[PDB]
């Protein structure tokens, strides 16, 4: 979670500086092509948060839902977790739609610059880490439990179905 949650804030920070310290998404949009590099990382991270298969976050987030669904757990608590996972996609899509797609609501005279090497490298390294960190850690940490891998077809992809839904 540290890799991609941190990445989103830096990408969010990039949008803030360009738009003259504007944080309201209701004064943004149409930045998909204006700032392609921030757009790539922001979309990359927003997918990591939502749990795209084989991407840092899937190797931890999805494993939790599989263990949660298949455990002697609390029924209502389980339902809250699954409903929340769906809410992750909704507000994540809110950030992308209101700040990358559509037409730009921001003012006329604005300095939208992204070529600063410090800004790019800071995002770039986490962008690399935001994709490969999950695979590396999951394949190097020694086993410490007996994970559950056999389950009904609907308890092995509920997180994938709900987020897509």
């Amino acid at each position: 979670h540290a890799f991609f949650k941190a990445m989103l804030f830096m990408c969010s920070g990039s949008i803030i500086h360009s738009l003259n310290d504007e944080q309201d998404i209701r004064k943004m949009g149409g930045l998909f092509k204006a700032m392609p590099f921030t757009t790539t990382a922001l979309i990359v991270g927003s997918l990591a948060l939502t749990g795209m298969p084989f991407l840092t976050g899937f190797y931890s987030k999805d494993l939790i839902i599989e263990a949660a669904n298949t455990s002697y757990t609390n029924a209502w608590a389980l339902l809250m977790t699954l409903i929340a996972t769906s809410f992750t996609a909704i507000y994540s899509t809110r950030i992308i739609f209101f700040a990358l797609l559509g037409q730009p609501r921001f003012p006329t005279l604005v300095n939208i610059n992204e070529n600063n090497p410090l800004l790019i490298n800071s995002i770039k390294r986490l962008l690399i880490g935001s994709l490969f960190a999950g695979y590396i850690i999951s394949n190097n940490i020694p086993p410490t439990t007996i994970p559950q891998m056999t389950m009904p077809y609907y308890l092995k992809t509920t997180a994938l179905i709900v987020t897509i839904l």
Binding site: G30, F32, K33, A34, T39, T40, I43, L47, T93, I96, F97, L100, L101, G102, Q103, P104, R105, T108
Partner: protein, 81 residues
């Protein structure tokens, strides 16, 4: 410096969603005075924009191309030696 403002006689509401507002406010006897003030947001580079599905699919044509060649590349030295 003496930054130059682009010529103002190029903000055409027609051909943009701001025009459809004129088609609507005409039905009641009124006009949108600031339609040409918002016109710069729909024309030029800002004209059109990828959809949400297209945004996710950014840079997928190349990746799939690498995937197809990559799997085939492994296949070559898979059952050969």
């Amino acid at each position: 410096s003496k930054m130059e403002l682009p010529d103002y006689k190029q903000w055409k509401i027609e051909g943009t969603p701001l025009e459809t507002v004129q088609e609507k406010l005409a039905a009641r006897g009124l006009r949108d005075p600031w339609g040409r003030n918002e016109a710069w947001r729909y024309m030029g580079g800002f004209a059109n924009n990828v959809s949400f599905v297209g945004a996710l699919l950014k840079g997928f044509k190349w990746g799939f191309a690498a995937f197809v060649v990559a799997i085939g590349a492994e296949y070559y030295l898979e059952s050969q030696k």
